[PDB]
Coordinates of C-alpha atoms and ligand atoms in Angstrom, one line a residue:
Chain A
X1 CA -119.0 -167.3 110.0
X2 CA -116.3 -164.8 110.8
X3 CA -117.3 -161.3 109.3
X4 CA -121.0 -160.5 108.8
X5 CA -121.8 -157.0 107.9
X6 CA -125.1 -155.1 107.4
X7 CA -124.7 -151.5 106.2
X8 CA -127.6 -149.4 105.3
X9 CA -126.0 -147.0 102.8
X10 CA -122.2 -146.6 102.7
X11 CA -119.5 -149.1 103.7
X12 CA -115.9 -148.1 103.3
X13 CA -112.5 -148.9 104.7
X14 CA -111.3 -145.4 104.0
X15 CA -113.8 -142.7 102.9
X16 CA -112.7 -139.2 101.9
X17 CA -116.1 -137.8 101.0
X18 CA -117.1 -134.3 100.2
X19 CA -120.8 -133.4 99.9
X20 CA -122.5 -130.8 97.8
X21 CA -122.0 -127.1 97.7
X22 CA -118.6 -127.6 99.4
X23 CA -115.3 -125.8 99.1
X24 CA -112.3 -128.3 99.2
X25 CA -109.1 -126.2 98.7
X26 CA -105.5 -126.4 99.8
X27 CA -105.6 -130.0 100.9
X28 CA -102.6 -132.4 101.3
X29 CA -103.7 -136.0 102.1
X30 CA -101.0 -138.7 102.7
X31 CA -102.3 -142.3 103.4
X32 CA -100.4 -145.6 103.9
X33 CA -102.4 -148.7 104.7
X34 CA -100.5 -152.0 105.5
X35 CA -103.3 -154.4 106.1
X36 CA -102.7 -158.2 106.3
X37 CA -105.3 -160.9 107.0
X38 CA -104.6 -164.5 107.9
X39 CA -107.5 -167.1 107.9
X40 CA -107.4 -170.6 109.2
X41 CA -111.2 -171.8 109.3
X42 CA -112.7 -175.1 109.3
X43 CA -109.7 -177.3 109.8
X44 CA -110.5 -181.0 110.7
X45 CA -108.0 -183.6 111.8
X46 CA -109.8 -187.0 112.2
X47 CA -107.8 -190.2 112.4
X48 CA -110.8 -192.4 112.4
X49 CA -114.5 -191.6 112.1
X50 CA -117.1 -194.3 112.1
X51 CA -121.0 -194.0 111.6
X52 CA -122.8 -197.3 112.2
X53 CA -126.5 -198.1 111.9
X54 CA -127.7 -201.7 112.5
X55 CA -131.3 -203.0 112.6
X56 CA -132.0 -206.6 113.5
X57 CA -135.4 -208.2 113.6
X58 CA -135.9 -211.9 114.7
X59 CA -139.2 -213.9 114.7
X60 CA -141.0 -210.7 115.5
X61 CA -144.7 -209.9 114.9
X62 CA -145.2 -206.1 114.1
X63 CA -148.5 -204.7 113.3
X64 CA -150.3 -201.2 113.2
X65 CA -146.8 -199.6 112.9
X66 CA -147.0 -195.9 111.9
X67 CA -144.1 -193.6 111.6
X68 CA -144.8 -190.0 110.5
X69 CA -142.1 -187.3 110.0
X70 CA -142.0 -183.6 110.8
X71 CA -144.2 -181.0 109.0
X72 CA -147.5 -182.9 109.0
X73 CA -150.2 -180.7 107.9
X74 CA -153.8 -182.4 107.8
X75 CA -157.3 -181.1 107.4
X76 CA -156.6 -177.4 107.0
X77 CA -159.5 -175.2 105.7
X78 CA -159.2 -171.5 104.7
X79 CA -162.5 -169.6 104.0
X80 CA -162.3 -165.9 103.2
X81 CA -165.6 -164.7 101.6
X82 CA -165.7 -161.2 100.1
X83 CA -169.2 -160.0 99.3
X84 CA -169.5 -156.4 98.3
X85 CA -173.1 -154.9 97.3
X86 CA -173.4 -151.4 96.0
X87 CA -176.3 -149.2 95.9
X88 CA -175.7 -145.7 94.5
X89 CA -172.4 -145.5 96.2
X90 CA -168.9 -144.3 95.3
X91 CA -166.3 -147.0 95.8
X92 CA -162.7 -145.6 96.2
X93 CA -160.2 -148.5 97.1
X94 CA -156.8 -147.1 96.6
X95 CA -154.5 -150.1 97.7
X96 CA -156.5 -152.9 99.3
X97 CA -154.5 -156.2 99.9
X98 CA -155.8 -159.7 100.7
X99 CA -152.9 -162.0 101.4
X100 CA -153.2 -165.6 102.4
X101 CA -150.1 -167.8 103.2
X102 CA -147.5 -165.5 101.8
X103 CA -143.9 -166.8 102.3
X104 CA -140.7 -164.9 101.5
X105 CA -137.9 -166.8 102.9
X106 CA -138.2 -170.6 103.5
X107 CA -134.8 -172.3 104.1
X108 CA -135.0 -175.9 105.1
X109 CA -131.9 -178.0 106.2
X110 CA -131.8 -181.6 107.5
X111 CA -135.6 -181.9 107.9
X112 CA -135.7 -185.8 108.1
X113 CA -136.9 -188.7 110.3
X114 CA -133.6 -190.4 111.1
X115 CA -130.4 -188.3 110.7
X116 CA -126.7 -189.1 111.3
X117 CA -124.4 -186.2 110.5
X118 CA -121.0 -184.7 111.3
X119 CA -119.5 -181.2 110.8
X120 CA -120.8 -177.8 110.2
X121 CA -124.3 -176.4 109.2
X122 CA -124.6 -172.7 108.6
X123 CA -127.6 -170.6 107.6
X124 CA -127.4 -166.8 106.9
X125 CA -130.2 -164.5 106.0
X126 CA -130.0 -160.9 105.1
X127 CA -132.9 -158.7 103.7
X128 CA -134.3 -155.2 103.7
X129 CA -138.0 -155.7 104.1
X130 CA -140.9 -153.5 102.5
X131 CA -144.3 -154.9 102.2
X132 CA -146.6 -152.3 101.4
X133 CA -145.8 -148.6 100.2
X134 CA -148.8 -146.4 99.3
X135 CA -147.9 -142.9 98.5
Chain B
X1 CA -119.6 -166.1 114.8
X2 CA -116.7 -163.5 115.5
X3 CA -117.8 -160.1 114.0
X4 CA -121.4 -159.5 113.5
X5 CA -122.2 -155.8 112.6
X6 CA -125.3 -154.0 112.1
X7 CA -125.0 -150.3 110.9
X8 CA -128.0 -148.2 110.0
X9 CA -126.3 -145.8 107.7
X10 CA -122.5 -145.4 107.4
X11 CA -119.7 -148.0 108.4
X12 CA -116.1 -146.8 108.0
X13 CA -112.8 -147.8 109.6
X14 CA -111.5 -144.3 108.7
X15 CA -114.1 -141.6 107.6
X16 CA -112.8 -138.2 106.6
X17 CA -116.4 -136.8 105.8
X18 CA -117.3 -133.1 104.9
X19 CA -121.0 -132.2 104.7
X20 CA -122.7 -129.6 102.6
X21 CA -122.2 -125.9 102.5
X22 CA -118.8 -126.5 104.1
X23 CA -115.4 -124.6 103.8
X24 CA -112.5 -127.1 104.0
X25 CA -109.4 -125.0 103.4
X26 CA -105.7 -125.4 104.5
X27 CA -105.9 -129.0 105.7
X28 CA -102.8 -131.3 106.1
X29 CA -103.8 -134.9 106.8
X30 CA -101.4 -137.7 107.3
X31 CA -102.5 -141.2 108.1
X32 CA -100.7 -144.5 108.8
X33 CA -102.7 -147.7 109.5
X34 CA -100.8 -150.9 110.2
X35 CA -103.6 -153.4 110.8
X36 CA -103.1 -157.2 111.1
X37 CA -105.8 -159.8 111.7
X38 CA -105.0 -163.5 112.6
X39 CA -107.8 -165.9 112.6
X40 CA -107.9 -169.6 114.0
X41 CA -111.6 -170.6 113.9
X42 CA -113.2 -174.1 114.1
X43 CA -110.2 -176.3 114.5
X44 CA -110.9 -179.9 115.4
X45 CA -108.5 -182.5 116.5
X46 CA -110.4 -185.9 117.0
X47 CA -108.3 -189.1 117.1
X48 CA -111.4 -191.3 117.1
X49 CA -115.0 -190.4 116.8
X50 CA -117.7 -193.1 116.8
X51 CA -121.5 -192.9 116.4
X52 CA -123.4 -196.1 117.0
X53 CA -127.1 -196.9 116.6
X54 CA -128.4 -200.5 117.2
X55 CA -131.9 -201.8 117.2
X56 CA -132.7 -205.4 118.1
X57 CA -136.1 -207.1 118.3
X58 CA -136.6 -210.6 119.3
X59 CA -140.0 -212.7 119.4
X60 CA -141.8 -209.4 120.2
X61 CA -145.3 -208.6 119.5
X62 CA -145.9 -204.9 118.7
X63 CA -149.2 -203.4 117.9
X64 CA -151.0 -199.9 117.7
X65 CA -147.5 -198.3 117.6
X66 CA -147.5 -194.7 116.5
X67 CA -144.7 -192.1 116.3
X68 CA -145.3 -188.6 115.2
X69 CA -142.5 -186.0 114.7
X70 CA -142.6 -182.3 115.5
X71 CA -144.8 -179.7 113.6
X72 CA -148.0 -181.6 113.5
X73 CA -150.8 -179.3 112.4
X74 CA -154.2 -181.0 112.4
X75 CA -157.8 -179.8 111.9
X76 CA -157.1 -176.1 111.6
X77 CA -160.0 -173.7 110.4
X78 CA -159.6 -170.0 109.4
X79 CA -162.9 -168.1 108.6
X80 CA -162.7 -164.5 107.9
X81 CA -166.0 -163.3 106.3
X82 CA -166.0 -159.8 104.7
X83 CA -169.5 -158.6 103.9
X84 CA -169.8 -154.9 102.8
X85 CA -173.4 -153.6 101.9
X86 CA -173.6 -150.0 100.6
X87 CA -176.7 -147.7 100.4
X88 CA -176.0 -144.2 99.0
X89 CA -172.6 -144.0 100.8
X90 CA -169.2 -142.7 99.9
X91 CA -166.5 -145.5 100.4
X92 CA -163.0 -144.2 100.8
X93 CA -160.5 -147.1 101.7
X94 CA -156.9 -145.8 101.2
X95 CA -154.8 -148.7 102.4
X96 CA -156.7 -151.5 104.0
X97 CA -154.9 -154.9 104.5
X98 CA -156.1 -158.4 105.3
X99 CA -153.2 -160.6 106.1
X100 CA -153.6 -164.2 107.0
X101 CA -150.6 -166.4 107.9
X102 CA -147.8 -164.2 106.5
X103 CA -144.3 -165.4 106.9
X104 CA -141.2 -163.5 106.0
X105 CA -138.2 -165.5 107.5
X106 CA -138.5 -169.3 108.2
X107 CA -135.2 -171.0 108.8
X108 CA -135.3 -174.7 109.9
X109 CA -132.4 -176.8 110.9
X110 CA -132.4 -180.4 112.1
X111 CA -136.1 -180.7 112.7
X112 CA -136.2 -184.5 112.7
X113 CA -137.5 -187.4 114.9
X114 CA -134.2 -189.1 115.9
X115 CA -130.9 -187.2 115.2
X116 CA -127.3 -187.8 116.0
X117 CA -124.9 -185.0 115.2
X118 CA -121.5 -183.5 115.8
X119 CA -120.0 -180.0 115.5
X120 CA -121.3 -176.6 114.9
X121 CA -124.8 -175.2 114.0
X122 CA -125.1 -171.5 113.4
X123 CA -128.1 -169.3 112.3
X124 CA -127.9 -165.6 111.6
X125 CA -130.6 -163.3 110.6
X126 CA -130.4 -159.6 109.8
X127 CA -133.2 -157.5 108.3
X128 CA -134.6 -153.9 108.4
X129 CA -138.4 -154.4 108.6
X130 CA -141.2 -152.1 107.2
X131 CA -144.5 -153.6 106.9
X132 CA -147.0 -150.8 106.0
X133 CA -146.2 -147.3 104.8
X134 CA -149.0 -145.1 103.9
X135 CA -148.1 -141.6 103.1
Chain C
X1 CA -119.9 -165.0 119.4
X2 CA -117.1 -162.4 120.1
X3 CA -118.0 -159.0 118.8
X4 CA -121.7 -158.3 118.3
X5 CA -122.4 -154.6 117.4
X6 CA -125.7 -152.8 116.7
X7 CA -125.2 -149.2 115.6
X8 CA -128.2 -147.0 114.7
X9 CA -126.5 -144.6 112.2
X10 CA -122.7 -144.3 112.1
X11 CA -120.1 -146.8 113.2
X12 CA -116.3 -145.7 112.7
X13 CA -113.0 -146.8 114.2
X14 CA -111.8 -143.1 113.5
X15 CA -114.2 -140.4 112.3
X16 CA -113.1 -137.0 111.3
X17 CA -116.5 -135.6 110.6
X18 CA -117.5 -132.1 109.6
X19 CA -121.0 -131.1 109.4
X20 CA -122.8 -128.5 107.3
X21 CA -122.3 -124.8 107.2
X22 CA -118.9 -125.2 108.9
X23 CA -115.4 -123.5 108.6
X24 CA -112.6 -126.1 108.7
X25 CA -109.4 -123.9 108.2
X26 CA -105.7 -124.2 109.2
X27 CA -105.8 -128.0 110.4
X28 CA -102.9 -130.3 110.7
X29 CA -104.1 -133.9 111.5
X30 CA -101.6 -136.6 112.2
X31 CA -102.7 -140.2 112.8
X32 CA -101.0 -143.5 113.4
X33 CA -102.9 -146.6 114.1
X34 CA -101.0 -149.9 115.0
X35 CA -103.9 -152.3 115.5
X36 CA -103.5 -156.1 115.8
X37 CA -106.1 -158.7 116.4
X38 CA -105.3 -162.4 117.2
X39 CA -108.2 -164.9 117.3
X40 CA -108.4 -168.5 118.6
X41 CA -112.0 -169.4 118.7
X42 CA -113.7 -173.0 118.7
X43 CA -110.6 -175.2 119.2
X44 CA -111.4 -178.8 120.1
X45 CA -108.9 -181.5 121.2
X46 CA -110.8 -184.8 121.5
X47 CA -108.9 -188.0 121.8
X48 CA -112.0 -190.2 121.7
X49 CA -115.6 -189.3 121.4
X50 CA -118.2 -191.9 121.6
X51 CA -122.1 -191.7 121.0
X52 CA -124.0 -194.9 121.5
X53 CA -127.7 -195.7 121.3
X54 CA -129.0 -199.2 121.8
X55 CA -132.5 -200.6 121.9
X56 CA -133.3 -204.2 122.7
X57 CA -136.7 -205.8 122.9
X58 CA -137.3 -209.4 124.0
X59 CA -140.6 -211.3 124.0
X60 CA -142.4 -208.1 124.8
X61 CA -146.0 -207.3 124.1
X62 CA -146.5 -203.6 123.3
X63 CA -149.9 -202.0 122.4
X64 CA -151.5 -198.6 122.4
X65 CA -148.1 -197.0 122.2
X66 CA -148.2 -193.3 121.1
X67 CA -145.2 -190.9 120.9
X68 CA -145.8 -187.3 119.8
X69 CA -143.0 -184.7 119.3
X70 CA -143.2 -180.9 120.1
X71 CA -145.2 -178.4 118.3
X72 CA -148.4 -180.3 118.2
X73 CA -151.3 -178.0 117.1
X74 CA -154.6 -179.6 117.0
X75 CA -158.3 -178.5 116.6
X76 CA -157.6 -174.6 116.3
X77 CA -160.4 -172.4 114.9
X78 CA -160.2 -168.7 113.9
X79 CA -163.3 -166.7 113.3
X80 CA -163.1 -163.1 112.5
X81 CA -166.3 -161.9 110.9
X82 CA -166.3 -158.4 109.3
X83 CA -169.9 -157.1 108.6
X84 CA -170.2 -153.3 107.5
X85 CA -173.6 -152.0 106.6
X86 CA -173.8 -148.4 105.2
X87 CA -176.9 -146.1 105.1
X88 CA -176.2 -142.7 103.7
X89 CA -172.9 -142.6 105.5
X90 CA -169.4 -141.3 104.5
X91 CA -166.8 -144.0 105.1
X92 CA -163.2 -142.8 105.5
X93 CA -160.8 -145.6 106.3
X94 CA -157.2 -144.3 105.8
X95 CA -155.0 -147.2 107.1
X96 CA -157.0 -150.1 108.6
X97 CA -155.2 -153.4 109.1
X98 CA -156.6 -156.9 110.1
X99 CA -153.6 -159.2 110.7
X100 CA -154.0 -162.8 111.7
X101 CA -150.9 -165.0 112.5
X102 CA -148.2 -162.7 111.0
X103 CA -144.7 -164.1 111.5
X104 CA -141.5 -162.2 110.8
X105 CA -138.6 -164.3 112.1
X106 CA -138.9 -168.0 112.8
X107 CA -135.7 -169.8 113.4
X108 CA -135.8 -173.4 114.5
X109 CA -132.8 -175.6 115.5
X110 CA -132.7 -179.1 116.8
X111 CA -136.6 -179.5 117.3
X112 CA -136.6 -183.2 117.4
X113 CA -138.0 -186.1 119.5
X114 CA -134.7 -187.9 120.5
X115 CA -131.5 -185.9 120.0
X116 CA -127.8 -186.7 120.6
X117 CA -125.4 -183.8 119.8
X118 CA -122.1 -182.4 120.6
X119 CA -120.6 -178.9 120.1
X120 CA -121.8 -175.3 119.5
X121 CA -125.2 -174.1 118.6
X122 CA -125.5 -170.3 117.9
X123 CA -128.4 -168.2 117.0
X124 CA -128.2 -164.5 116.2
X125 CA -131.0 -162.1 115.2
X126 CA -130.7 -158.4 114.4
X127 CA -133.5 -156.2 113.1
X128 CA -134.9 -152.7 113.0
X129 CA -138.7 -153.1 113.2
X130 CA -141.4 -150.8 111.9
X131 CA -144.8 -152.3 111.5
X132 CA -147.2 -149.4 110.8
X133 CA -146.4 -145.9 109.5
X134 CA -149.2 -143.8 108.6
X135 CA -148.4 -140.1 107.8
Ligands
NAG1 C1 -102.7 -123.0 98.6 O1 -101.3 -123.3 98.5 C2 -100.6 -122.5 97.5 C3 -99.2 -123.1 97.6 O2 -98.8 -123.4 98.9 C4 -100.6 -121.1 98.1 O3 -99.9 -120.3 97.1 C5 -102.1 -120.7 98.1 O4 -102.1 -119.4 98.6 C6 -102.9 -121.6 98.9 N1 -104.3 -121.1 98.9 C7 -104.8 -120.1 99.7 C8 -106.2 -119.9 99.5 O5 -104.1 -119.5 100.4
NAG2 C1 -96.2 -145.5 105.0 O1 -96.0 -144.4 104.2 C2 -95.5 -143.3 105.0 C3 -95.4 -142.1 104.0 O2 -94.1 -141.5 104.1 C4 -94.1 -143.6 105.7 O3 -93.6 -142.5 106.3 C5 -94.3 -144.9 106.5 O4 -93.0 -145.3 106.8 C6 -94.9 -146.1 105.7 N1 -95.1 -147.1 106.6 C7 -94.8 -148.5 106.1 C8 -95.2 -149.5 107.1 O5 -94.6 -148.6 105.0
NAG3 C1 -103.6 -181.5 111.3 O1 -102.5 -182.3 110.7 C2 -101.5 -182.9 111.7 C3 -102.1 -184.2 112.1 O2 -102.9 -184.1 113.2 C4 -101.3 -182.0 112.8 O3 -100.0 -182.0 113.2 C5 -101.5 -180.5 112.4 O4 -101.1 -179.6 113.4 C6 -103.0 -180.3 112.0 N1 -103.2 -179.0 111.4 C7 -103.8 -178.0 111.9 C8 -103.9 -176.8 111.0 O5 -104.2 -177.9 113.1
NAG4 C1 -155.1 -201.0 113.5 O1 -155.5 -202.3 113.6 C2 -156.9 -202.6 113.4 C3 -157.2 -204.2 113.6 O2 -155.9 -204.8 114.0 C4 -157.2 -202.1 112.0 O3 -158.6 -202.2 111.8 C5 -156.8 -200.6 111.8 O4 -157.1 -200.2 110.4 C6 -155.4 -200.5 112.2 N1 -155.0 -199.1 112.1 C7 -154.5 -198.5 110.9 C8 -154.2 -197.1 110.9 O5 -154.5 -199.1 109.8
NAG5 C1 -102.9 -122.0 103.3 O1 -101.5 -122.3 103.2 C2 -100.7 -121.4 102.4 C3 -99.3 -122.1 102.4 O2 -98.9 -122.4 103.8 C4 -100.7 -120.1 102.8 O3 -100.0 -119.2 101.9 C5 -102.3 -119.5 102.8 O4 -102.3 -118.2 103.4 C6 -103.0 -120.5 103.7 N1 -104.4 -120.1 103.7 C7 -104.8 -119.1 104.4 C8 -106.4 -118.7 104.1 O5 -104.1 -118.4 105.2
NAG6 C1 -96.4 -144.5 109.8 O1 -96.3 -143.4 109.0 C2 -95.7 -142.2 109.8 C3 -95.6 -141.1 108.8 O2 -94.4 -140.4 109.0 C4 -94.4 -142.6 110.4 O3 -93.9 -141.6 111.2 C5 -94.6 -143.8 111.3 O4 -93.3 -144.4 111.8 C6 -95.2 -145.0 110.4 N1 -95.4 -146.2 111.3 C7 -95.1 -147.4 110.9 C8 -95.5 -148.5 111.9 O5 -94.8 -147.7 109.8
NAG7 C1 -104.0 -180.4 116.0 O1 -103.1 -181.2 115.4 C2 -102.1 -181.9 116.4 C3 -102.8 -183.3 116.8 O2 -103.4 -183.0 117.9 C4 -101.8 -181.0 117.6 O3 -100.5 -181.1 118.1 C5 -102.0 -179.5 117.2 O4 -101.6 -178.5 118.2 C6 -103.5 -179.2 116.8 N1 -103.7 -178.0 116.2 C7 -104.2 -176.9 116.7 C8 -104.4 -175.7 115.8 O5 -104.6 -176.9 117.8
NAG8 C1 -155.7 -199.7 118.2 O1 -156.1 -201.0 118.3 C2 -157.6 -201.3 117.9 C3 -157.8 -202.6 118.2 O2 -156.6 -203.4 118.6 C4 -157.8 -200.7 116.5 O3 -159.3 -200.9 116.3 C5 -157.5 -199.3 116.4 O4 -157.6 -198.9 115.1 C6 -155.9 -199.1 116.8 N1 -155.5 -197.7 116.7 C7 -155.2 -197.1 115.5 C8 -154.8 -195.7 115.6 O5 -155.1 -197.8 114.5
NAG9 C1 -102.9 -120.9 108.1 O1 -101.5 -121.2 108.0 C2 -100.8 -120.5 107.1 C3 -99.4 -121.0 107.1 O2 -99.0 -121.4 108.5 C4 -100.8 -119.0 107.5 O3 -100.0 -118.2 106.6 C5 -102.2 -118.5 107.7 O4 -102.3 -117.2 108.1 C6 -103.0 -119.4 108.4 N1 -104.5 -119.0 108.5 C7 -105.0 -118.0 109.1 C8 -106.4 -117.7 109.0 O5 -104.2 -117.3 109.8
NAG10 C1 -96.7 -143.5 114.5 O1 -96.4 -142.4 113.7 C2 -96.0 -141.3 114.5 C3 -95.8 -140.1 113.5 O2 -94.6 -139.4 113.7 C4 -94.6 -141.7 115.1 O3 -94.1 -140.6 115.9 C5 -94.8 -142.9 116.0 O4 -93.6 -143.3 116.5 C6 -95.4 -144.0 115.2 N1 -95.7 -145.1 116.1 C7 -95.5 -146.4 115.6 C8 -95.7 -147.5 116.7 O5 -95.0 -146.6 114.5
NAG11 C1 -104.6 -179.4 120.6 O1 -103.5 -180.2 120.2 C2 -102.5 -180.9 121.0 C3 -103.2 -182.2 121.4 O2 -104.0 -182.0 122.7 C4 -102.3 -179.9 122.2 O3 -101.0 -180.1 122.7 C5 -102.5 -178.5 121.8 O4 -102.1 -177.5 122.8 C6 -104.0 -178.2 121.4 N1 -104.1 -176.9 120.8 C7 -104.7 -175.9 121.4 C8 -104.7 -174.6 120.4 O5 -105.1 -175.9 122.5
NAG12 C1 -156.2 -198.2 122.7 O1 -156.6 -199.7 122.9 C2 -158.2 -199.8 122.6 C3 -158.3 -201.3 122.8 O2 -157.3 -202.0 123.2 C4 -158.5 -199.3 121.2 O3 -159.9 -199.4 121.0 C5 -158.0 -197.8 121.0 O4 -158.2 -197.6 119.7 C6 -156.5 -197.7 121.3 N1 -156.2 -196.4 121.3 C7 -155.8 -195.8 120.1 C8 -155.4 -194.3 120.2 O5 -155.6 -196.4 119.1

């Protein structure tokens, strides 16, 4: 990345801003902007690139061979009982939340067992989070 | 990365800002901006790049071979009972939260068993968090 | 990275700012800005790069071989009972939170078993945290 910007409200190169209930009288504004941008990003000069994978098996006895990749979830139990017994009561639940395994952003790249790779990998995440808002 | 910016409210190269209830009279503003940017990022000059992987097995006896990658979750139990018994009571739950395994940002890169790689890996995360807001 | 900036409210190269209830009279502002930026970042000059992995097995007897990567979670138990018995009572729970394994930012890079890599790895995280706000 080159230019990553997070701005809460207002982003401006030039901002002539006047707010409310304001007197803006007898103003002479002169502005000259000579802006130039030159970009040379991700230039590659490879005369020879070689990726080689070789597997050779000869008169071999293989048994009980197990290969497991990443992210192996096994024998997982969730138990969230919710028992509510009432007896001449006044129940007032305004905003009650029961969240189980809530995912917002899941970015996965090159999650493998055997990988051979060359170059650039980029991940960018921007957000403005707000889970619960009870007024 | 080159230029990473976090700004809460206002980002400006030039900001002529006037707020409320203001008198802005008899003003002469003159502005000249000669801005130049030159960027030479991620330039690679490789005459010869070689990646080599070789596996050779000869008259070999392999048994009980186990390979497990990362992120191995096994035999995980969650138990969150919620028993509520009422007897002539006044229940007032305004904002009650029960959160189990809540994920917001999960970025995964090159999570493997065997990896051969070359270059640049970049991860950028920006956020403005707010979980619970009870007014 | 080159330029990492965190700013709470206001970021400005030039800020002519006038607040409220202000008298701004008889002002002569003259501004000249000659700004130049030159960037030469991440330049690589490799005549020959070699990565080599070789495995050779000969008349070998292998047994009970176990390889486990990172992040191995096994036999994990969570138990959070919540028993509430009422008897002519007045329950007032404004903002009660029960959080179990709450993740906000999880960035993972090159979490492997065997890794061969070359270059640049960058991780940048910016946030403005606020978990609980009970007014
Ligand atoms: C604004 O400029 C004009 C022309 O220069 C002038 O006649 C006028 O009086 C100015 N305003 C005030 C409030 O003086
Ligand atoms: C920008 O404009 C102003 C306005 O008169 C002038 O004086 C200045 O020479 C200009 N600059 C360029 C680089 O054109
Ligand atoms: C890539 O092309 C040629 C061959 O290597 C080289 O002379 C040139 O300078 C390179 N270009 C850049 C932008 O580096
Ligand atoms: C391992 O080998 C034994 C006997 O050779 C077999 O009973 C067992 O099932 C094998 N393991 C697996 C996971 O299959
Ligand atoms: C603003 O400028 C004009 C012209 O120069 C002038 O006549 C006027 O009196 C000025 N304003 C005030 C409040 O003096
Ligand atoms: C910018 O503009 C002002 C306005 O008169 C001028 O005096 C100055 O020479 C200018 N500069 C350039 C670099 O153009
Ligand atoms: C890459 O290209 C040629 C070959 O190595 C070299 O002369 C040149 O200076 C390089 N370019 C840059 C921008 O470094
Ligand atoms: C290991 O080998 C024994 C006998 O050789 C077998 O019973 C067992 O199942 C093997 N282990 C696995 C995990 O399969
Ligand atoms: C502002 O400038 C003008 C012109 O130079 C002048 O006539 C006026 O009196 C000034 N303002 C005040 C409040 O003196
Ligand atoms: C910037 O502008 C001012 C305005 O008169 C001028 O005096 C100065 O020479 C200028 N500088 C450049 C570098 O252009
Ligand atoms: C890379 O390219 C050539 C080959 O090594 C070298 O002469 C040049 O100075 C290098 N470029 C940079 C920007 O260092
Ligand atoms: C280790 O070997 C014994 C006998 O050789 C076998 O019973 C056992 O299961 C092996 N271990 C594993 C983890 O398989």
